[PDB]
Antibody, heavy 220, light 214 residues
Framework: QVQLVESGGGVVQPGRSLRLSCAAS????????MHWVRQAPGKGLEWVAV????????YYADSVTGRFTISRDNSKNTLYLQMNSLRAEDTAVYYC????????????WGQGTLVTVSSASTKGPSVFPLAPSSTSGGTAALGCLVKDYFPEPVTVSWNSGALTSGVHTFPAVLQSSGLYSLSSVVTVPSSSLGTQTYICNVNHKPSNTKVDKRVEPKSC | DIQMTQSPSTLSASVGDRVTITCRAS??????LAWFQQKPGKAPKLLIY???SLESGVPSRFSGSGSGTEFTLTISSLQPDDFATYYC?????????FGQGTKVEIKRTVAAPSVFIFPPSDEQLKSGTASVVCLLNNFYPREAKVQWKVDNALQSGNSQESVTEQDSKDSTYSLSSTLTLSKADYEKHKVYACEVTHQGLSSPVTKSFNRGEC
């Protein structure tokens, strides 16, 4: 059926340029207007640009006028966004979107591609234990501090997926160094530390980093 | 462009409540106003077009009204799968512009946090930094205050906080706070504590440790 696939996202130093692409199948791409929309991390949707089927017009959000260029190749069934003079505030997930009518319909949205604009450089995370401490009963919290990575995202699982109940993985914060840090925690019965193994699984695809860190109480 | 201002930015309601969201345009948009629903990791869904027409297959408990510069989305009886973020969007003019969004969260009873404190690992101390972590687990409402104290001295500017979305099972939040110090500043002090203030706590809860398992 109807699908839209963005590619070309990654990281960019400020003032530089990046080109996105979106490929379409399952609908008559050569007769549809096509839009870009972006969404910065946990912020709102922002409309970026639109181009009709024949390219006869190109419209742009005020914040990207003069720096961004939308174009299309109906032959290949693909849409492009050329971004120049990129700024920190252009960091966002970029989506292609269309419609069988005029307005956006959920069927016609892409999966998104992340773009991060920053003077920081790609970096894999350091993974540190958040060690638990009465151990005969009660509740223990433990976790992993996933620190100083770039760009987003990391994924965190626990015991390779077999531990999901009580897991909270927090949204990253941006440190003043330009690097991200987050935490992942789980509450377990404190008596389980004597019988059970707890390992957090961290993945940072942008740096090909894969860490498994066992989290144990520290030796008194 | 035409600037769209939604209010409120956040809202807590219970199942069965009547919910009303307002959107104001900076100039007239006639009736070319749309409302969308977005759940996280989901594509936006069109609810209302041209200000008051219901999209095909959208519960009749959703309605919209208005013209000109002031517009309203209303949910007559709030249902469980309607807790989401709601955007208005004008299409009178290019550039198309979205409002900033309205998050509709679930109301529930007060629930005080379970508090936990984590010292920095030896591994991170070898690297020259110390992160101290304070966890506030499963609390409601979202408002909480975390104060770091080092040998009883309030700290400021050296911590960052993050909060989860509402849990799917029990509608609470959790919050993580990290205090960051250089290894040098860390070893200059003994007592590390986070103090937590919250509605479900009759007085502030403190959790602490002494550097060097003391």
């Amino acid at each position: 059926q109807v699908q839209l696939v963005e590619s070309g996202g990654g990281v960019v130093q400020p003032g530089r340029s990046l080109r996105l692409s979106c490929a379409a199948s399952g609908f008559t791409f050569s007769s549809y207007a096509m839009h870009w929309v972006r969404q910065a991390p946990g912020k709102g949707l922002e409309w970026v640009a639109v181009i009709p089927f024949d390219g006869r017009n190109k419209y742009y959000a005020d914040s990207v006028t003069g720096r961004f260029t939308i174009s299309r190749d109906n032959s290949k069934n693909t849409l492009y966004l050329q971004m120049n003079s990129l700024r920190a505030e252009d960091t966002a997930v970029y989506y292609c979107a269309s419609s069988s009518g005029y307005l956006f319909h959920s069927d016609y949205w892409g999966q998104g591609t992340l773009v991060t604009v920053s003077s920081a450089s790609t970096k894999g995370p350091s993974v540190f234990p958040l060690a638990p401490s009465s151990t005969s009963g009660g509740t223990a919290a433990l976790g992993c501090l996933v620190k100083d990575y770039f760009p987003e995202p990391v994924t965190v699982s626990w015991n390779s997926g077999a531990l999901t109940s009580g897991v909270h993985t927090f949204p990253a914060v941006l440190q003043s160094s330009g690097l991200y840090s987050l935490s992942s925690v789980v509450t377990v019965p404190s008596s389980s530390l004597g019988t059970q193994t707890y390992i957090c699984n961290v993945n940072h695809k942008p740096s090909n980093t894969k860490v498994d860190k066992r989290v144990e109480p520290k030796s008194c | 462009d035409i600037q769209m201002t939604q209010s409120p930015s956040t809202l807590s309601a219970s199942v069965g409540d009547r919910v009303t969201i307002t959107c104001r345009a900076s100039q007239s948009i006639s009736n070319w106003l749309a409302w969308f629903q977005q759940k996280p990791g989901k594509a936006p869904k069109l609810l209302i077009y041209e200000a008051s027409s219901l999209e095909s297959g959208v519960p009749s408990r959703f309605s919209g009204s208005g013209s000109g510069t002031e517009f309203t989305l209303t949910i007559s009886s709030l249902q469980p799968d309607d807790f989401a973020t709601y955007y208005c969007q004008q299409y009178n003019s290019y550039p198309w512009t979205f409002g900033q969004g309205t998050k509709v969260e679930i109301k529930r009873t007060v629930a005080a946090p379970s508090v936990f404190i984590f010292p920095p690992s030896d591994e991170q101390l070898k690297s020259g930094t110390a992160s101290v972590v304070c966890l506030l687990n499963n609390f409601y409402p979202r408002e909480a205050k975390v104060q770091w104290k080092v040998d009883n001295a309030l700290q400021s500017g050296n911590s960052q906080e993050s909060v989860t979305e509402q849990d799917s099972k029990d509608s609470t939040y959790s919050l993580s706070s990290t205090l960051t110090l250089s290894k040098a500043d860390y070893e200059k002090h003994k007592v590390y504590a986070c103090e937590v203030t919250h509605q479900g706590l009759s007085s502030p809860v403190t959790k602490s440790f002494n550097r060097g398992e003391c």
